[PDB]
Structure 1
Amino acid sequence: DFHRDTWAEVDLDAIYDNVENLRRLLPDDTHIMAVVKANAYGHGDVQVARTALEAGASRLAVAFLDEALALREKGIEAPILVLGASRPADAALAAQQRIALTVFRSDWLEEASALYSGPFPIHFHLKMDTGMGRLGVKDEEETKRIVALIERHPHFVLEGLYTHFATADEVNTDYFSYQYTRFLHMLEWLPSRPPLVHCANSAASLRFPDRTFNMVRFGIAMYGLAPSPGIKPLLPYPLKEAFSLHSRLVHVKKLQPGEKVSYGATYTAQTEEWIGTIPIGYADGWLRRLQHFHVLVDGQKAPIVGRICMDQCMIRLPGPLPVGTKVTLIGRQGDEVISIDDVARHLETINYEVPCTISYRVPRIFFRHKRIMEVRNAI
């Protein structure tokens, strides 16, 4: 239940299709690892994880331990890999919750070894830095050492090893190739190929599906968003956008010329205008930078006038509309549509950041099989 007329809608049918289409494109030996970090990119962790698994994914990935434990608590029983770092003293916790960990330092293992002695086995995924410069091992003696410590511990298992690309969404493939080639060279530092070798993100897997090894880490595209605009025309199938955001007019009034609106009085009515107030502001992730952006109301675009407030903002209406009238900030209304890509453009950022920013304050309504399936209200 929610008591403010502002909410996001998440179409799980769209997410289902985005994953199934990829399942249809990959070799039947290749696993799809659904990346669901950051509450599924602001779409809802368990709701997306479930749908993805139903569509063909066999594993899930999160950013840090807390995100994995939360999925376990909500009943997800499929394998989960923590992509980022964790504390050596937390290995036992991840072990008994059947959570796989990313490893990239030999001193971490030495510490973990002194802290853990079974009985649950711990599955590690070795990260190799091939040119992203974030996480990962970079030299032979380190890789060999990490492997040695793993092989020597009765409850440490090297389940996989992977790398991440810095430029897989760029039309130019020069740095990509260097990373790919660097990866192939480093894989030779291992005495034997672990069961899971992975390297592809949304861009790499949809662009070069044959050179993705045995596991793909599917993220941004699962949500229906293109990794980048320069890669959109090169996409194998149409992506279906899943996120939409709506509100309703809670007040309508007519301003006389010379009348001002909001903080600092930076907006002045030049004529007799109709102004509508909506219950969404920057504490909801609708950042102040979005002043001047246009929202949809009654099938028409209306500009956000005056400064955006913490919980509210105003728009110049086409004419006098009734209170309760639906306002679409992201999504479709009749002939007009506003995409997350349109919002990112205005905020001078990339689509990834947008749904992530729509805060915990905004409830998520899920659709599946073309029917309302669940409402998630964080507070």
Structure 2
Amino acid sequence: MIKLCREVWIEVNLDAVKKNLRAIRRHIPHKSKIMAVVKANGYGHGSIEVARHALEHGASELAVASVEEGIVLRKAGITAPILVLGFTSLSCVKKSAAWNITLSAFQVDWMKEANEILEKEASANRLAIHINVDTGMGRLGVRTKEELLEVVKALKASKFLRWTGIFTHFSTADEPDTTLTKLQHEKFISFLSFLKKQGIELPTVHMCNTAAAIAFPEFSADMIRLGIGLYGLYPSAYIKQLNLVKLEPALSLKARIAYVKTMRTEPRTVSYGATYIAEPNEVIATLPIGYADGYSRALSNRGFVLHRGKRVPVAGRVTMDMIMVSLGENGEGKQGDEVVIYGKQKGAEISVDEVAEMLNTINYEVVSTLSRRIPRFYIRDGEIFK
């Protein structure tokens, strides 16, 4: 089946991504479109194949972190609209207009100089722009209704720019306390009511992330931005509890056993620092994955893997390329057996959310730090490719 020189890989199940998209479509209003977020190599899953599938099954537009990440998508043949969520330097204004990438802006002087650059070169293309309004996140965006109007005034006087959206971001929509979420919404609405009482037409309006699409579908306005929900992961345990929508996890991580031996001769120390000493009838197995792959060293003498449907412990310290596990006295196993690191095997499961708890972080970090030297295989209609 799968053939590798070093035997470790990732499996990503696209049939699961498709069911996550259907669950979200039925729950939100029909007038509202879906923009799929695939920044940071598709939250670790691989960005090319997941953007392709998503656009075949419900998404209309895409979001990324930087001009460079959008260029990898256009090079694979994707023609849909693509919005950059971070800040972009004026260095890349000409390049973004040529690959037809949409950028966010919120400054009167950036607006002005962006227009000049494309003016002084004639340019048949018009750069599309989305305005970001800061109602409580404190990261980027415009902050008062009077200076938002200067920006609207300026963007309108720019013949080489095109206004195609306006948006904001919720900073606590995954927590039981809904105080601040209700306040940001109130502020955002009054700024567009301000702009509307002057003859200004509004383009596409969007505010919801995964959690706010599930708890407040009445905020869906024109469009939502589906992020961690697309990969089948819940933004918090509280949003998982309201039992409103059913998601399925897309990703598992596997490998094959490299060597087996019984610890009969001395010494019987195991790994750097000699932090674990074996028994003379103990069986010890060696796997090809390490902390340079993204398997945290903090799981030394702590975490597990699944061999033959059993949980088994890491023995000693994690190293850069390999880990060691214990099979017990007279344990059972062969060079070449299959092991599951994140995922499900026979009747067992080690979930991404468990490993995240064990390390005191959130599931976003676990998946999106898995290295690119590990190959990703895709399963669609129960079969393999790439």
**What is the TM-score when the length of structure 2 is the normalising length?**
0.93
Given that 1:196 and 1:214 are in contact with CA atoms closer than 8 Å, whether structure 2 keeps it comes out as yes
Q: Which residue of 2 aligns with 1:312?
A: 322
Alignment equivalent of 1:277, drawn from 286, 289, 301: 286
Distance 2:190 2:70 in 1: 32
Q: 1:259 to 1:335 in 2, by over 3 A?
A: same
Point out the more displaced range, 140-149 or 251-260.
251-260
Q: How far apart are the structure 1 equivalents of 2:307 and 2:235? A: 29
What residue in structure 2 maps to residue 109 of structure 1? 111
In structure 2, the CA distance between the partners of 1:143 and 1:2, relative to structure 1 (3 Å rule), is farther
Instruction: Name the amino acid aligned to 1:314.
Output: M
Query: Residue 286 in 1 paired to residue 288 in 2?
Result: no
Kept in 1: contact 2:10–2:254 (CA 8 A):
yes
Counterpart in the other structure of 1:29: 31
Q: What's the secondary structure of 1:269's corresponding residue?
A: coil
Match of 2:16 among 14, 17, 23: 14
Give percent identity, aligned residues only: 44
Task: Spell out the pairing of 1:231-270 with structure 2 (5 A cutoff).
Answer: 231-256=239-264, 259-270=268-279
Q: Deviations over 1:156-214 (max 9, x none)?
A: 11111101111111122111112111211222343534321000000001221122111
8 Å CA contact retained: 2:134, 2:142 = yes
Q: CA deviation at 1:142?
A: 2.5
Instruction: Tell me, in whole angstroms, the C-alpha distance in 1 between the residues paired with 2:5 and 2:380.
Output: 23
Q: Which amino acid in structure 1 is aligned with residue 313 of structure 2? A: P
Map of 1:344 onto structure 2: 356
- Mean Cα displacement is larger for which, 143-152 or 255-264? 255-264
Matches within 5 A, 1:141-290: 141-191=146-196, 192-256=200-264, 259-270=268-279, 272-290=281-299
Letter paired with 1:354: V
Instruction: State the SS of the aligned residue for 2:115.
Output: helix
1:28 Cα deviation after fit? 2.2
- Deviation string 1:304-354 (CA, Å, 9 cap, x unpaired) is 111111110011125130011111001111111011101111221100011
What secondary structure sits across from 2:156 in the alignment?
Answer: helix
Which one of 288, 298, 304 corresponds to residue 308 of structure 2? 298
Query: Quick check: 2:115–2:159 contact (8 Å CA) kept in 1?
Result: no
Correspondence for 1:4: 6
Please tell me the root mean square deviation across aligned C-alpha atoms, in Å: 1.6
Q: How many residues matched?
A: 374
Alpha-carbon separation, structure 2, partners of 1:340 and 1:88: 39
Which string of whole-angstrom CA distances, capped at 9 and with x for unpartnered residues, describes residues 18-60 of structure 1?
0122122222221100000011101111111011111110000
AA at the equivalent of 1:115: I
Q: Counterpart of 2:35 in 1: which secondary structure?
A: strand
Structure showing greater radius of gyration is: 2
State how far apart, in whole Å, the 1-side matches of 2:113 and 2:283 are: 66
TM-score (norm 1): 0.95
